[PDB]
Symmetry: D2
Subunit: 210 residues, 4 copies
């Protein structure tokens, strides 16, 4: 299960432990679909969130660094990222579509903004390559690369922390770019925990876009 | 997978996400080579790179006396749901130490008498408790007369890194004996589900003294 | 500042870092600003509380000294975003101190035996259990074993260091009628100290963010 | 009140502190049912706790720092999850013309086919062209959160950081170390220096008994 985002990003489901019944078992402390769903909706509406900590996901995420800096602020989660200190860094950058500037009345066409973003990326990356080849250590050379460079990370997160993430990122105050990643997270979450996700939306979800 | 502990306790594995390779994929950042993979497990553990191990997660169902659970729930990087005394009527189950538990200390009465003395008050406390329940005292007030050796039950979800920390501290002769026994059972399950992390852990990172002595 | 709770319990404030302005200072870094103004700083607090920006309140930290029955400590220490150090029954000979509810503890429940009888029966097992504990000790039973006969209403003591965001989560859950009465009492006194040290943050919390019921009814 | 300048334009500034060495003694002492004693006993205890890896008592010493750092430093630093951060937002403010230019001497030990000064120059040029593109996009009405994506990782950011002594010592183990990138090591040197000033006994004990790095 993989969902492409932005121009070259994605979120893939790597692994999941448990399902809706995992929260049910924990809440009951032990080990009829209408009784179990009812308990899920009961916990969600009253803010009993701890039973949801026993459903856990691991995602593999390709995201621009500026999205990843916002993402990694969520501290109740586990991350492992590619090191730019050690990997020769890929020619992969997020270039916004022209549609990204809809509703903004701009001096220069959205199409020239795009072009201006990609030119800097191109000159930054080429300066970076000039630096490597002359023997500047990678850890120094990449400091000239722009914030739209793509990075990759594994994110392991339980469903409670995943719901707090969606409260803050599946919402129109979050930067658009991370909203799109948040939508994808929600979709995988829905697939894997339909009852939890459905109760989340009804009783506890604080954002707007979902 | 279920292991009896003490007189009435147990450690039961409810669930696991991942195995040794889940730490490897996370260190490499790759979704999709035994010798090499094992070599890396060893490498991360040798050089203190412990984050990749946070991507293996266990859920245990644990039954233990409250004095043991209070030591255990002090480990905060973990998720707990415990049987509520406020809401459920509590079962006549109490940890009563073996005389084998005190043999090793010089006492002035036979350990048989320690067993009978402990059993005695458990019995009187529990009766007072039931009398209070029956007479209409809410359970959450009636249970405060119950002694610390009352058995409780919890689901614990914990990643392998935090589990290793748990083992450093609880799988060790400095820890109270009762919880050591629970740690041995946690270790055994860990060893079974992640043999490469476990051996690498014992070789490089483990700070305690029992798991190097006592098999599994 | 020391507030007495229950018959022998207390919440004492050991230390505080920062005050309301700590949070303003922290929030202002986002907009390339420092401290700005004595009344613009208060409004920024309301604003943060109103829109759910909780991170700046992490920069206010308290250390409390708390004496409380184990059954209360057990519920309290469930709050994982905090630091605790507790009196150890493995290494210390525990004192004769136990929470004996007063007869008024049973207001609103029909009982079968009078409330002072309930109080009496609680005292009785407490005195039995503690005698045994002492008999066990005298006999050479190590403390870590002897104490397992002691009841849940035994008082214990702990340091708790906890930031204002986490302490607001604690008030959400514990200064509320769904939480057990005894810990409610403790959450009131915690509320009183938060309020004395962080009055702006505290007023804003009650008005915009607080989910419990009792602090809107019960002064301070 | 303390302030230490790091790199060409960065700093570490102590904003506030809660407690001191005795804060840990006090918290530790509660366990044995004791309190503060003489200077000899209390110093001895701090050393004892550090030797045996009893680190919970150090959680009761707290620091607030105000740090100015290039994003590539702050991105590593922010991986330390047991801490609180508030940072300058590229979403909401006009970012300043401030970037870390490595000095010529940063390249000591590497044979370069371009004199270190020209490296320095090349980094300045690219940074300048980026910042000009950023300003031009802002002036033309491109939203700040978008225009800034062209800015490089050597751009200076600002943050407040609140962190307890235990998590501070973990940060020192990992960043006060030659395996860590030079730039973060420098910030770590600043952090350690202030830690030392405010909690001398703890710091000495940490250095002698628990500190895992090589540069302190
Ligand atoms: C629209 C929006 C604009 C924002 N702008 C800014 C900005 O200007 N500056 C900035 O620095 N960041 C900003 N952020 C980041 C945001 O404030 C948090 O850093 C991020 O959302 C993580 O939230 P969290 O702490 O709830 O999640 P996590 O860190 O994953 O924590 C999860 C939950 O655990 C609790 N918690 C965890 N750790 C602690 C702790 N140490 N103390 C107390 N409670 C804790 C909280 O209840 C929290 O909800 C912004 C976020 C969004 C969505
Ligand atoms: C009225 C009420 C009745 C309850 N009855 C029960 C019961 O029957 N059984 C029982 O076991 N317990 C019960 N509790 C305890 C409850 O389940 C919580 O453990 C406790 O209240 C602490 O709440 P917290 O997790 O919000 O606080 P903390 O554990 O301090 O966490 C605070 C915040 O940090 C975040 N957070 C921290 N760690 C994690 C994590 N690992 N994953 C995701 N998010 C995290 C959350 O956002 C949370 O808001 C009860 C509590 C109350 C108030
Ligand atoms: C033999 C022994 C005797 C002990 N006696 C006492 C006693 O007398 N009194 C007492 O109160 N407790 C005592 N304990 C409990 C002990 O102090 C620890 O709280 C417990 O062992 C869990 O330790 P932890 O913090 O490593 O685990 P967790 O809480 O799971 O934390 C795991 C890891 O996360 C980090 N971490 C998590 N939260 C924080 C934080 N808030 N700040 C900084 N770093 C953090 C640490 O690096 C830690 O190793 C005893 C434990 C043992 C094993
Ligand atoms: C020289 C070096 C090279 C590195 N290269 C890489 C790389 O390629 N990729 C990469 O992603 N990062 C890398 N890092 C970052 C590293 O993986 C950690 O994210 C960072 O060092 C934070 O360490 P920490 O998690 O121990 O500290 P914190 O995250 O603050 O945690 C402090 C302590 O609390 C405990 N703890 C906190 N949260 C949890 C949890 N959820 N589960 C279990 N235990 C917990 C641990 O005991 C930990 O030691 C590198 C770091 C260094 C120093
Ligand atoms: O020494 C390092 C190397 C990597 N990382 C983490 C921080 C980033 O989130 C990610 C990539 O860092 P760079 O290697 O790109 O600096 O890994 C560190 O914290 N320290
Ligand atoms: O109101 C409550 C009820 C329970 N618990 C937690 C504490 C224990 O870990 C467990 C059982 O508590 P009692 O219900 O036995 O008090 O759940 C609370 O934190 N608050
Ligand atoms: O070996 C120990 C000793 C103490 N504690 C913690 C748990 C309780 O919060 C408090 C009291 O524990 P006892 O000494 O009563 O077991 O200290 C432990 O976690 N492990
Ligand atoms: O919507 C936001 C805005 C900011 N931040 C955090 C992430 C960074 O650590 C810091 C600045 O991010 P930017 O505003 O530069 O994205 O604040 C977020 O997490 N989400």
């Amino acid at each position: 299960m993989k969902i492409d985002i932005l121009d070259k990003g994605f979120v893939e489901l790597v692994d999941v432990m448990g399902n809706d019944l995992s929260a049910v078992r924990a809440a009951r402390v032990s080990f009829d679909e209408e009784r179990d769903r009812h308990l899920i909706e009961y916990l969600m509406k009253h803010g009993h969130e701890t039973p949801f900590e026993h459903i856990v996901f691991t995602f593999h995420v390709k995201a621009p660094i500026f999205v990843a800096r916002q993402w990694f602020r969520h501290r109740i989660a586990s991350y492992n990222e590619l090191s730019g200190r050690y990997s020769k860094l890929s020619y992969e950058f997020y270039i916004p579509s022209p549609e990204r500037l809809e509703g903004y009345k701009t001096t220069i066409p959205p199409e020239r903004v795009t072009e201006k973003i990609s030119e800097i990326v191109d000159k930054a990356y080429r300066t970076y390559l000039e630096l490597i080849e002359s023997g500047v250590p990678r850890e120094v050379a990449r400091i000239v690369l722009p914030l739209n460079l793509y990075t990759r990370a594994f994110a392991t997160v339980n469903a409670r922390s995943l719901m707090n993430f969606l409260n803050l990122r599946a919402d129109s105050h979050a930067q658009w770019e991370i909203q799109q990643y948040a939508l994808a997270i929600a979709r995988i979450f829905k697939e894997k925990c339909p009852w939890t996700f459905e109760a989340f939306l009804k009783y506890a979800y604080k954002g707007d876009i979902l």
